[PDB]
Design a protein around this ligand. Structure first.
Ligand code: NAG
Ligand code: NAG
Ligand code: NAG
Ligand code: NAG
Ligand code: NAG
Ligand code: NAG
Lengths: 330, 332
């Protein structure tokens, strides 16, 4: 547990003792030194602050600290087990708050899970926002000549990782704000669109057009809306773009207005029905852009009674009170 | 018996002889003459060839021929019964061409028939154009103040008289040609208007208006039409003047035209329907009579789709193709 001045120290692979002394020494016998270090392929032994501290580099074989007095017989060696060795490797069960892991023996981490959440750098790996993640991390050693693989450590997560603090579990896809069913931050997996619960609204999107006020619309908020506190759109309504056989569509035949927003519409039926908007531009007959002269012929008739023919322009009998009209346009 | 030169002749009601001679004489004593005629209310005695022939004018009382010689006593009178008095009436069945009848015994003809077609003068009567007539003519004689009535003869026509030549069986009433259902000439009975037949029509009169051409009308000929041949109108049809729910009437509210004819019409319902005519008068907006300034606002829309509000003047969404119109009319 501590380095003593009149003792010899070494690292051992076994506890056995023979006629010439301890068996299985991995290092040579080293005299006491303040800060003295013993080194082999598996461990680094350091004499620090009058205390014995260790740093494992590999755990494939069991290691001991061998102690022998300078005056004593070489067969009087004392061993202190540092760690038990397993060639197939140690199996670590990842706890709920597990984040960082280091693969021993300079092994490469091989991740087998629900979705990739791991950041990898040499033998080091990082589980980034593993919310709902299950699977294993296998520390593997390859061979340049034989091409055989050996496992030195297995990190396992049987049941899903619970919710983790400091993880954004909402992601913008295009302009729509989606929920992260699994993961967080960049490890996020898209589920469904987030729904409007409350809060201040920046704008709303309905039938492919943007609105910031209720005027002209059936109601407000409508369709999907973006909060002043977010960059994406949350789903508010499922309201139909089809109104009286008149469907508001981003690529429409005729332009008209809903409040301040210019809207495009298409006819679904040729029935007599209203437009779900207000006129885009009202052109005058005497207007500078277009000149069209108006003249009309009229006669006396009985109420709701018509004479032949039907107005050339309107294709209908123009009747008001006890009079019939026939217009002539430029 | 015959007449002889040295005898006197007379007509008698009886065979009785008194101290002064014959007592039932109806005529005066007449001397022999070659055509000698004796006349009374019942008989006409004529000695045509020296041989007597008779013509009865009544048979209710018995008549005798009284003969008396010029040299003999007036009580030596001889009587020859001409006929026995028959108090029962005769019954004549009027033939198809029967026209004149004479009531015997100077009786008055009493006519009981379908309609009045008889000309009457004393006992004489005349059936004037009796086409379809049925009934009886009773020759009646009333005596003193008894009030008793006696039928001397009955003229009967059980089945109707057939059509008779030389009788006009069509009469004009105002301007319409009517058919004479019974009679003819002045005895005519008119009940229905003559139905049209033939090729040449002068003019038609439907709903109180005159037409000479098919233009504007439902069809032609229509209503009552006059032939080039006649003065009156003949019935062609009963077609309604109520065209839809609009009536064509001689005294109407609004004037309009059917062909060349100016027609007057009245509304019977306010339901959306057509006028059965063409406009009478077409007044222009820029016309000299009246001036009306026309201006309009328009926008693009979808077919049969409207924007608010309705046209102020038309109280309707003015839509043509993909354009909506709003008119502004101002009187000048
Ligand atoms: C999975 O994880 C690695 C580590 O961040 C990342 O670079 C890689 O792009 C991921 N795979 C995909 C296809 O997103
Ligand atoms: C997730 O992102 C936020 C904001 O960039 C950051 O504060 C947080 O540390 C990230 N979480 C992890 C586990 O990297
Ligand atoms: C503000 O935005 C955050 C996400 O950045 C969201 O979780 C929160 O619910 C929003 N605030 C309100 C009041 O809805
Ligand atoms: C003609 O006939 C009518 C109807 O029967 C009758 O009232 C009228 O008195 C008759 N007139 C003559 C002149 O016979
Ligand atoms: C009817 O009148 C016509 C014309 O005057 C005449 O020829 C005819 O004899 C008349 N018939 C009778 C029976 O009155
Ligand atoms: C005219 O002709 C019709 C037959 O088409 C005939 O009934 C009518 O009596 C004729 N009139 C004259 C005056 O000839």
């Amino acid at each position: 547990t501590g380095c003593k001045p009149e003792y010899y120290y070494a690292i051992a692979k076994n506890d056995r003792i023979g006629p010439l002394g301890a068996e299985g020494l991995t290092t040579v016998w080293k005299d006491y030194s303040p800060e003295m270090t013993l080194e082999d392929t598996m461990v680094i032994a350091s004499c620090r602050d009058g205390k014995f501290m260790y740093l494992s580099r590999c755990t494939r074989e069991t290691r001991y600290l061998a102690i022998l007095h300078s005056r004593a017989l070489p067969t009087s060696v004392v061993f202190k087990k540092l760690f038990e060795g397993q060639k197939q490797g140690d199996t670590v069960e990842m706890d709920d708050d597990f984040e960082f892991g280091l693969c021993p023996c300079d092994a490469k981490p091989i991740v087998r899970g629900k979705y990739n959440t791991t950041l990898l750098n040499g033998p080091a790996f990082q589980m980034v926002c593993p919310i709902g993640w299950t699977g294993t991390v296998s520390c593997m050693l390859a061979n340049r000549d034989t091409l055989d693989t050996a496992v030195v450590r297995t990190y396992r997560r049987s049941r899903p990782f619970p919710y983790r603090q400091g993880c954004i579990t909402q992601k913008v896809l295009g302009e729509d704000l989606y929920d992260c069913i699994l993961g967080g931050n960049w490890t996020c997996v898209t589920g469904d669109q987030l729904q409007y619960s409350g809060g201040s609204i920046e704008s709303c999107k309905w039938c492919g057009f943007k609105f910031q006020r209720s005027e002209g619309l059936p109601h407000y908020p409508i369709g999907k809306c973006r909060l002043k506190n977010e960059t994406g759109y949350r789903l508010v309504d499922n309201t139909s773009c089809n109104r009286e056989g008149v469907a508001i569509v981003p690529q429409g035949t005729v332009k008209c207005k809903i409040g301040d927003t210019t809207v495009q519409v298409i006819a679904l039926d040729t029935k007599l029905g209203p437009m779900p908007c207000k006129p885009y531009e009202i052109i005058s007959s005497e207007g500078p852009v277009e000149k069209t002269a108006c003249t009309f012929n009229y006669t006396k008739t009985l109420k709701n009674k018509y004479f032949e023919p039907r107005d050339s322009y309107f294709q209908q009998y123009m009747l008001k009170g006890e009079y019939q009209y026939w217009f002539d346009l430029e």
